[PDB]
Design a protein around this ligand. Structure first.
Ligand SMILES: CCCCCCCCCCCCCCCCCC(=O)OC[C@H](COP(=O)([O-])OCC(O)COP(=O)([O-])OC[C@@H](COC(=O)CCCCCCCCCCCCCCCCC)OC(=O)CCCCCCCCCCCCCCCCC)OC(=O)CCCCCCCCCCCCCCCCC
Ligand SMILES: CCCCCCCCCCCCCCCCCC(=O)OC[C@H](COP(=O)([O-])OCC(O)COP(=O)([O-])OC[C@@H](COC(=O)CCCCCCCCCCCCCCCCC)OC(=O)CCCCCCCCCCCCCCCCC)OC(=O)CCCCCCCCCCCCCCCCC
Ligand SMILES: CCCCCCCCCCCCCCCCCC(=O)OC[C@H](COP(=O)([O-])OCC[N+](C)(C)C)OC(=O)CCCCCCCCCCCCCCCCC
Ligand SMILES: CCCCCCCCCCCCCCCCCC(=O)OC[C@H](COP(=O)(O)OCCN)OC(=O)CCCCCCCCCCCCCCCCC
Ligand SMILES: CCCCCCCCCCCCCCCCCC(=O)OC[C@H](COP(=O)(O)OCCN)OC(=O)CCCCCCCCCCCCCCCCC
Ligand SMILES: CCCCCCCCCCCCCCCCCC(=O)OC[C@H](COP(=O)(O)OCCN)OC(=O)CCCCCCCCCCCCCCCCC
Ligand SMILES: CCCCCCCCCCCCCCCCCC(=O)OC[C@H](COP(=O)(O)OCCN)OC(=O)CCCCCCCCCCCCCCCCC
Ligand SMILES: CCCCCCCCCCCCO[C@@H]1O[C@H](CO)[C@@H](O[C@H]2O[C@H](CO)[C@@H](O)[C@H](O)[C@H]2O)[C@H](O)[C@H]1O
Ligand SMILES: CCCCCCCCCCCCO[C@@H]1O[C@H](CO)[C@@H](O[C@H]2O[C@H](CO)[C@@H](O)[C@H](O)[C@H]2O)[C@H](O)[C@H]1O
Ligand SMILES: CCCCCCCCCCCCO[C@@H]1O[C@H](CO)[C@@H](O[C@H]2O[C@H](CO)[C@@H](O)[C@H](O)[C@H]2O)[C@H](O)[C@H]1O
Ligand SMILES: Nc1nc2c(ncn2[C@@H]2O[C@H](COP(=O)(O)OP(=O)(O)OP(=O)(O)O)[C@@H](O)[C@H]2O)c(=O)[nH]1
Ligand SMILES: N=C(N)NC(=N)NCCc1ccc(I)c(Cl)c1
Ligand SMILES: [Mg+2]
Lengths: 98, 320, 48, 459, 347, 112
């Protein structure tokens, strides 16, 4: 009917570049794209990122809370107090209705 | 000061630069009528600017470096293909015709812009007023479809109505047997494939439709082939014309200012030559037009507006 | 000479260029003067 | 957040001022660097959130969502650069600009302090996403997919705008830190019922809730690979993040208003899991799998327990990597056979051995094999819904069976059996494709070693 | 038209508007409308064709009828208060008559039928004036008389306009008719908020004018008046297709674009007044506008429609139309949301 | 005042800084307008007519500064009017008696 270009044939990157990493037709650009993805993706973000996460300074106070709980359990048991009380807040500071 | 309302206000009125020598002349005729040679002699003798007939590459001649561009940037219109295979399924026949009418429309605008800006008359070979004779010949011979003719008339209707007709129409009447003999002598292999029936169709349209129509509104001079050889007599005939017809008598500075604002803006000239009428002969798919447009922008001096192309030597782009 | 017809913007419009830069300079000088005058009037009115 | 917003913005001049042949190298390298710096948001405190300024804050919910967002941009660039190879330069840079702009809107969305600022960026994400789908999708149906995506979102989001503006008039502030302290209970009235619906429906549509999910299978089947990745990985989680925040100010009305949506989700997850068993389009199967997984997240958010909120956070992050990986796996086949029909190319394990391994690992995370964070998230929701009502275990357990069947049906159909005889263009897996799959699965599995960073504030 | 005459006629259109805006006397307001209508007709007629003559006649009949009703309102007001000051009116029947007259002048529903037809029948530059500058004078009177307008009447007009504008635009392929129905819808937002906060009326008017001028200017740049003709822009001026896309999305009220700001602010003012149903109904109904804006983006920017062969000839020539202020207006039309607090200058 | 952009009383307020972030954005908008001007006329976008691009930035900044001045003045007036009205009518804005949460009763809604 109209004047339209035919659908182009699918191009196999390996044909012209058997060493193609699949990033670019240009072999030099292709290699550099591979290197940045691998160096920044795996060497930097994943390895150093995993290391950074592994050594986070007591994430969200979990380790401090355990040390603090140990201190309170030690103190309360020695002085004969309950380990925990049902009332979070001192009743003398509360006024009830009615 | 590029022409506009401000230039018009400050005194650039067309009637100032125009004279009784400021005339628009068109030479018409069948193929191989020596109308090209007559047109040059009239222009030389009357001191007018001559326009060679607008072909497939006329627009290229007016833009860029002026040299022709590859074929794909004219859509692949081939006059040679028209002769070899006038019935090709690719639609080359009407695509060429639609392109050529647009090329003539652009040329008519250039000629009118020259006449109105400088006051010097012009000589054209055929015009948008006579382009239809080839369309009629194409249709009657079955080269184009009825739908193509309808499209052509739609485009002509909204374009030709904007422009004044020629002052003088010159017709060189050569009979088809003599036309057919001059063609075989010219020795162009594709042109010799032209048939007398096609040539008779052009003649019939010229005499049946064109000349009667232009006679109402223009000065029509008809010469046989022999008489056209006497260019001095032809020029003599032109200079003794009364000019008592047509719309050129109704024009004034206000109307000619409106006309000049149109012809100088070429995109405004060509606006309706691309009306969205989806005729298969002239319709181009998105993938092709996208690809061709991208190649066009890569041609030398075409990526940017003229004067802003460093790749062809433009300077001071950062102060322009 | 590459272009067949001389482009309307072949050469810079030096008058327009001069006016354009001159206008930009004026607005900046005016703006800084206005700001300076505004700062002082503010300091004076508030006693600072 | 300026240390992330500004470098994200700088990716745009970087892409536009790059040499023609280095747009993918430059944009990929520097978006990976931005992702690296995102780990600085892990400075979270047990009591207080990380409150940068009057505009932006980060807590344990938004932090993992931010790191996922900034991780996905480089992956999307790698995934897109092959099918965009023949595109002209300016239109490539425009495509990358839309991806960068989406990341900019997303990081600001997840850290906005004020709910109306959140709304505007929440809504700005529609524009680049819609453009990506309708301009760079391959099929005619992308135009209709754009419209369904657009008007499903705005149908719910415009009522949300009215509700939020009404709340600020009544309370005086939409700042989330302020709302934590000035929140008042919601009383039973028809006025509050529609306030509740206006506050939640926009987020339900984005999850998507069962019954309002029809736009999603359209959007995926039509979107390009990068559009599918961000749609599945992050954009669905706008809805989950939205509810997790806004439910603060809807109590105790959520006690009963949740019932219709828990029912739709509990039944919906079984319906959409069953649907996956009969899907013929591989991309449509993965899309329906997302609907089923997000049904758990909706249930988890609606029942509002510490265990359900932790499971919801882990599920959102885990599904982000799994689902995006599955789309990338399906796309890699599509780039060879140029069809999404699942049954067209079979026995691919014979032809692409290593790729079949990525298929196996993505399937095992999709069906939540322990101890993947996929399983951790789902299990925490199962534990909390059982306390909500013991009978939910029947529905949750049945959905686990169906999820295994369709996860492995997809694996068996495409990877095993006999290869199709006439499909002879299955070229070996490119280094780019293998790296793309590893950058999904490796962080996903590494998170199993330290799950707390993706469990959210309730941890 | 002689260029000097064109300038003087344009200056008289503006002077008529300015007289309305600076007048403190109802008679001078009426004169401003009469002067303005006298000068607008020639620019509607300037292309001399039956469609332009029909458009000018329909415009004349509508505007002259509305101006007689306005004069009647003024005279009733004179009898019941003995003064001419431009302010609240002192008679409910005078208030209704003036409100209906201004609604007819604005082309608000159900007095809207003339807007799509007149806009279609006149050139783009004339339609730009009709749908932007011509809204200034009637809005500036509503700004002053609103303390006495009937709330039910004005809100009924607003609701009908948003509905008719949204529905009417769904069925249009002509660009001039689309802008006309878009204008009817936008007038509805301007007047809906007027009883509550007139400053938001001014904000919506200003942003409406900027966005509307941008669309008309981009249509003029390419001489496009139909949807299909606009769909060829991608193959001639790709930059224009992107600017149209941004402007259309802004006109659709999508954040983070400028056109979201008026809808955002109007919803806020209405809710502060415990108006909840009306803003919600308005915002949902405005999705009809977004739909036929999106349709245009599809055929202009987001897909590539078929071209013609003669289009290649256009590649060799540059845009020569003035496109005055287009770069400035397109930026304002899309990138102003971060400066929203600036609306207080309109107080 | 009356039909005055910046009345004389606005001069008692601190002027906007020339490094105001909002003024930087206004300048950025002017720069974007300069680039679009190049694009729509098919000139080299970044390089063409730096004189024209400079005036685009300057014009936006110049107008933006005065608009920002009026904006801040109007908001200062809004606050001035509000506080003066609160003083004029102390009966309508009494100091609420504040109770601590120990005294205020709030119903508890368990999530079980
Ligand atoms: C600090 C930063 C650290 C960064 C991350 C470090 C880890 C990255 C490892 C990179 C290794 C590079 C390498 O050379 O590996 C070669 C390695 C073997 O080389 P190959 O023989 O040529 O592979 C052939 C096929 O590709 C593979 O053929 P295959 O089928 O024999 O192997 C596939 C294998 C893929 O990897 C595996 O899963 C290994 C098996 C599990 C250990 O998975 C399986 O073995 C199938 C069973 C999986 C389910 C097992 C049951 C779950 C039990 C739960 C245990 C929980 C413990 C508590 O390549 C792979 O196996 C591909 C996977 C690479 C990603 C590792 C994913 C591990 C999970
Ligand atoms: C804070 C809220 C958000 C921000 C608010 C922003 C509000 C807008 C700010 C004002 C925007 C004005 C346009 C920026 C100026 C850039 C145009 C330019 O460079 O023209 C240079 C101009 C001519 O340059 P061109 O080669 O024709 O091309 C420039 C554009 O294409 C010229 O194309 P055009 O058609 O667009 O020309 C427009 C201009 C005519 O073009 C101009 O001459 C620019 C005049 C700008 C005046 C500066 C306004 C700020 C001072 C306030 C008082 O129209 C006017 O008469 C000015 C109104 O050279 C001059 O004569 C400078 C003006 C001399 C006085
Ligand atoms: C057969 C059984 C094999 C079982 C599996 C392998 C077992 C190996 C165990 C030994 C390995 C060493 C080890 O234990 O590690 C120590 C630790 C776990 O041990 P730890 O937490 O108890 O403490 C170790 C360090 N100290 C003692 C100092 C506290 O490993 C990690 O914490 C690594 C967590 C990395 C998680 C982050 C991944 C990087 C993500 C990059 C961001 C981009 C992706 C987007 C992510 C989404 C958003 C969040
Ligand atoms: C579609 C086109 C038509 C648009 C829908 C029709 C409007 C439906 C309105 C529902 C009723 C909401 C309402 O009017 O509430 C008003 C009331 C105001 O009273 P107030 O004085 O402020 O406080 C005391 C409460 N009496 O109380 C309130 O203000 C509280 C309401 C908060 C704001 C509600 C927001 C709109 C709710 C309706 C949409 C909800 C459903 C969304 C579903 C979309 C799904 C895709
Ligand atoms: C703030 C918004 C600023 C709006 C600026 C709009 C400027 C016009 C857009 C540039 C288009 C090119 C142009 O020159 O305008 C066309 C028009 C003249 O018509 P035209 O056919 O081009 O030639 C006349 C010969 N008869 O010229 C005109 O008639 C101008 C029409 C627009 C005037 C109304 C603009 C809206 C109102 C602004 C006031 C804001 C309060
Ligand atoms: C700052 C705070 C406020 C934030 C609000 C959001 C601001 C964004 C809105 C700004 C206004 C829009 C300005 C966009 C400028 C567009 C310029 C551009 O990107 O390139 C156009 C491109 C040029 O093509 P060409 O003329 O041929 O030159 C290169 C040779 N090939 O032309 C083409 O090649 C055609 C491209 C095909 C069409 C693709 C369209 C998708 C890309 C849309 C980009 C614009 C975004 C508009 C929507 C807003 C997004 C937020
Ligand atoms: C502080 C740094 C800020 C960084 C963030 C900036 C982005 C936010 C602002 C965006 C607002 C729109 C900016 C104005 C658009 C200018 C770009 C343009 O319109 O031209 C596109 C141009 C095409 O290339 P060219 O070969 O020059 O062809 C010219 C075609 N007439 O392209 C070029 O080749 C010229 C090189 C510059 C291109 C800039 C393209 C920006 C695209 C933004 C898209 C809209 C935002 C999404
Ligand atoms: C007074 C305010 C003015 C502010 C102006 C600030 C910016 C001025 C920039 C001037 C330099 C522009 O530079 C001009 O455009 C681009 C971008 O560099 C260059 O060419 C470009 O080609 C490709 C992209 O197409 C890329 O490799 C790279 O972007 C550049 O090399 C042109 O060869 C150069 O002529
Ligand atoms: C997951 C890895 C992320 C990689 C991110 C890459 C970008 C790194 C940005 C480094 C920013 C460092 O920024 C700067 O560091 C120095 C340490 O020398 C700090 O120096 C200060 O630290 C603390 C501050 O309480 C004090 O001991 C003392 O005031 C001083 O030592 C500065 O407070 C900080 O401004
Ligand atoms: C997917 C669709 C989801 C649909 C969800 C539908 C939830 C329906 C919630 C019903 C509860 C609505 O809120 C309820 O309305 C009734 C009125 O009928 C209110 O009733 C109120 O007015 C009546 C007067 O008739 C008084 O008698 C009553 O004292 C008072 O509470 C209640 O204050 C409120 O408890
Ligand atoms: N199909 C078609 N061919 C055209 C058209 N105009 C010119 N031509 C062809 O252009 C060719 C040369 O044109 P002519 O000027 O008439 O021939 P010529 O011999 O060189 O010049 P003359 O001697 O003056 O007649 C002819 O073969 C024509 O067929 C047209 O509008 N349509
Ligand atoms: N008419 C209305 N409903 N609104 C309105 N204009 N209220 C007046 C209050 C106000 C608000 C902002 C500013 I800045 C200023 Cl100076 C005054
Ligand atoms: Mg010849």
């Amino acid at each position: 009917r109209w004047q339209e270009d035919p659908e182009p044939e699918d191009e196999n990157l390996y044909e012209k570049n058997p060493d193609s990493h699949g990033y670019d037709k240009d072999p030099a650009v292709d290699i550099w794209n591979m290197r940045v993805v691998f160096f920044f993706g795996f060497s930097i973000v994943l390895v150093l990122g995993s290391t950074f996460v592994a050594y986070l300074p007591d994430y969200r106070m979990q380790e401090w809370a355990r040390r603090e709980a140990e201190r309170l359990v030690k103190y309360r048991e020695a002085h004969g107090l309950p380990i925990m009380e049902s009332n979070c807040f001192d009743p003398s500071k509360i006024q009830l209705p009615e | 000061l590029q022409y506009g309302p401000l230039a018009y206000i400050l005194g650039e009125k067309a009637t100032k630069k125009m004279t009784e020598k400021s005339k628009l002349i068109t030479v018409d005729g069948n193929i191989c009528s020596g109308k090209s040679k007559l047109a040059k002699e009239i222009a030389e003798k009357l001191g007018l600017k001559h326009f060679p007939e607008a072909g497939i590459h006329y627009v290229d001649s007016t833009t860029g470096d002026g040299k022709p561009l590859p074929v794909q940037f004219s859509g692949n219109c081939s006059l040679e293909k028209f002769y070899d295979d006038p019935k090709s399924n690719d639609g080359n026949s009407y695509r060429l015709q639609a392109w050529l009418y647009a090329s003539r429309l652009l040329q008519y605008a250039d000629a009118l812009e020259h006449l109105l800006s400088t006051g010097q008359g012009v000589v054209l070979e055929r015009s948008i007023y006579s382009d239809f004779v080839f369309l009629e010949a194409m249709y009657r011979q079955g080269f184009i479809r009825k739908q193509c003719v309808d499209h052509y008339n739609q485009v002509k209707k909204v374009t030709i109505c904007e422009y004044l007709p020629p002052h003088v129409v010159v017709y060189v009447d050569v009979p088809v047997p003599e036309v057919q003999s001059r063609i075989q002598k010219k020795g162009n292999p594709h042109e010799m494939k032209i048939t007398s029936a096609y040539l008779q169709d052009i003649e019939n349209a010229y005499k049946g439709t064109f000349l009667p129509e232009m006679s109402e509104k223009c000065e029509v001079l008809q010469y046989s082939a022999w008489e056209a050889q006497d260019a001095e007599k032809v020029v003599e005939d032109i200079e003794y014309l009364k000019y008592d017809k047509g719309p050129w008598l109704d024009q004034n500075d206000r109307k000619l200012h409106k006309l000049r604002m149109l012809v100088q803006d070429k995109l405004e000239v060509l606006n309706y030559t691309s009306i969205p009428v989806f005729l298969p002969e002239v319709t181009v798919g998105a993938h092709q037009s996208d690809q061709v447009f991208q190649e066009f922008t890569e041609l030398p001096g075409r990526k940017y507006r003229a004067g802003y192309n460093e790749d062809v030597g433009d300077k001071w782009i950062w102060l322009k | 000479k590459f272009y067949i017809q001389e482009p309307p913007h072949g050469s810079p419009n030096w008058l327009k260029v001069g006016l354009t830069l001159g206008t930009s300079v004026f607005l900046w000088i005016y703006l800084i003067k206005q700001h300076n005058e505004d700062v002082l009037e503010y300091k004076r009115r508030n006693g600072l | 957040m300026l240390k992330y917003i500004i470098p994200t913005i700088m990716l745009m001049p970087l892409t536009w001022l790059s040499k023609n042949n280095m747009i993918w190298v430059n944009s990929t390298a520097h978006s990976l660097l931005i992702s690296f710096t995102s780990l600085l948001l892990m400075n979270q405190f047990g009591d207080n959130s990380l409150n940068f300024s009057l505009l932006f804050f980060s807590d344990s919910l938004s932090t993992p969502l931010l790191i996922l967002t900034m991780w996905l941009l480089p992956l999307m660039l790698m995934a897109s650069q092959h099918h965009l190879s023949k595109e002209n330069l300016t239109r490539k840079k425009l495509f990358i600009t839309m991806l960068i702009s989406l990341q900019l809107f997303l990081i600001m969305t997840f850290t906005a302090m004020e709910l109306i600022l959140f709304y505007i960026l929440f809504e700005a994400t529609l524009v680049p996403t819609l453009i990506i789908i309708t301009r760079w999708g391959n099929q005619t149906e992308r135009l209709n997919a754009g419209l369904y995506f657009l008007f499903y979102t705005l149908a719910g989001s415009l009522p949300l705008l009215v509700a939020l503006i009404y709340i600020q008039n009544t309370v005086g502030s939409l700042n989330f830190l302020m709302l934590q302290y000035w929140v008042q209970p919601v009383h039973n009235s028809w006025s509050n019922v529609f306030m509740w619906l206006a506050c939640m429906m926009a987020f339900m549509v984005k999850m998507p809730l069962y019954g309002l999910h029809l736009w999603l299978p359209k959007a995926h089947v039509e979107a390009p690979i990068a559009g599918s990745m961000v749609l599945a990985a992050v954009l669905l989680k706008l809805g989950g993040y939205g509810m997790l925040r806004i439910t603060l100010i809807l109590n105790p009305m959520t006690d009963f208003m949740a019932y219709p949506f828990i029912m739709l989700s509990l039944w919906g997850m079984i319906m959409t899991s069953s649907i996956c068993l009969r899907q013929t389009d591989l991309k449509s199967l993965i899309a329906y799998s997302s609907v089923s997984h997000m049904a758990l997240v909706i249930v988890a958010i609606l029942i509002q327990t510490p265990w359900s909120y932790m499971g919801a956070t882990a599920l959102m992050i885990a599904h982000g990597l799994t689902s995006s990986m599955l789309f990338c796996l399906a796309n890699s086949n599509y780039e060879r056979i140029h069809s999404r029909t699942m049954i067209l190319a079979r026995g691919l394990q014979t032809l692409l051995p290593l790729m079949a391994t990525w298929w196996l690992l993505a399937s095992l995370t999709n069906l939540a094999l322990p101890p993947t964070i996929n399983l951790i998230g789902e299990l925490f929701v199962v534990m909390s819904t059982f306390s909500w009502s013991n009978i939910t275990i029947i529905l949750m357990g049945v959905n686990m069976v169906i999820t295994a069947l369709y996860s492995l049906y997809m694996l068996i159909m495409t990877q095993r059996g006999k290869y199709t005889y006439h499909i002879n263009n299955i070229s070996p897996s490119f280094t780019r494709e293998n790296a793309l799959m590893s950058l999904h699965i490796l962080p996903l599995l590494l998170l199993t070693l330290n799950p707390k960073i993706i469990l959210g504030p309730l941890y | 038209m002689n260029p000097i005459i064109f300038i003087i006629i344009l200056l008289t259109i503006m002077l008529g508007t300015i007289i309305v805006m600076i007048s403190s006397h109802w008679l001078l307001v009426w004169i401003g409308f009469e002067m303005n209508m006298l000068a607008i007709i020639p620019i509607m007629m300037k292309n001399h064709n039956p469609r332009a003559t029909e458009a000018s006649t329909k415009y004349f009949l509508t505007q002259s009828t509305a101006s007689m009703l306005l004069m009647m309102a003024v005279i009733i007001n004179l009898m019941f208060s003995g003064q001419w000051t431009v302010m609240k009116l002192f008679n409910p029947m005078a208030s209704m008559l003036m409100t209906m007259a201004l609604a007819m002048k604005l082309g608000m529903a159900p007095f809207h039928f003339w807007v799509p037809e007149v806009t279609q029948g006149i050139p783009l530059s004339s339609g730009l004036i009709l749908l932007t500058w011509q809204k200034l004078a009637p809005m500036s009177v509503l700004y002053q008389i609103f303390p006495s307008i009937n709330l039910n009447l004005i809100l009924t007009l607003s609701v009908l306009s948003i509905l008719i504008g949204g529905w009417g635009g769904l069925n249009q392929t002509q660009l001039r008719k689309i802008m006309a129905y878009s204008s009817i819808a936008h007038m509805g937002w301007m007047t809906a908020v007027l009883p509550y906060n007139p400053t938001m009326t001014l904000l919506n008017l200003i942003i409406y004018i900027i966005m509307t001028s941008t669309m008309f200017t981009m249509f003029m740049a390419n001489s496009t008046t139909t949807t299909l003709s606009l769909s060829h822009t991608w193959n001639k001026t790709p930059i224009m297709t992107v600017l149209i896309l941004a402007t259309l999305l802004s006109m659709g009220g999508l954040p983070p674009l400028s056109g979201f700001m008026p809808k955002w602010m109007i919803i806020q003012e209405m809710t502060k007044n415990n108006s909840i149903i009306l803003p919600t109904f308005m915002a949902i109904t405005a999705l009809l506008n977004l739909y036929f804006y999106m349709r245009l983006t599809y055929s202009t920017t987001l897909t590539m429609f078929p071209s013609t062969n003669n289009m290649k000839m256009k590649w060799q020539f540059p845009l020569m139309k003035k496109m005055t202020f287009l770069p400035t207006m397109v930026v304002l039309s899309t990138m102003m949301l971060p400066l929203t607090p600036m609306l207080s200058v309109l107080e | 005042a009356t039909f005055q952009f910046l009345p004389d009383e606005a001069r008692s307020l601190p002027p906007p800084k020339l490094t105001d972030p909002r003024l930087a954005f206004v300048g950025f908008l002017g720069y974007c307008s300069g680039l679009i001007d190049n694009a729509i006329r098919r000139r080299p976008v970044l390089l063409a007519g730096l004189h024209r691009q400079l005036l685009y930035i300057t014009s936006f900044v110049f107008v933006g500064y005065y608009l920002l001045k009026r904006q801040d003045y109007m908001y200062a007036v809004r606050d001035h009017d509000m506080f003066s009205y609160i003083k004029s009518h102390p009966e309508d804005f009494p100091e609420k008696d504040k109770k601590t949460y120990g005294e205020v009763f709030e119903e508890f809604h368990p999530v079980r």
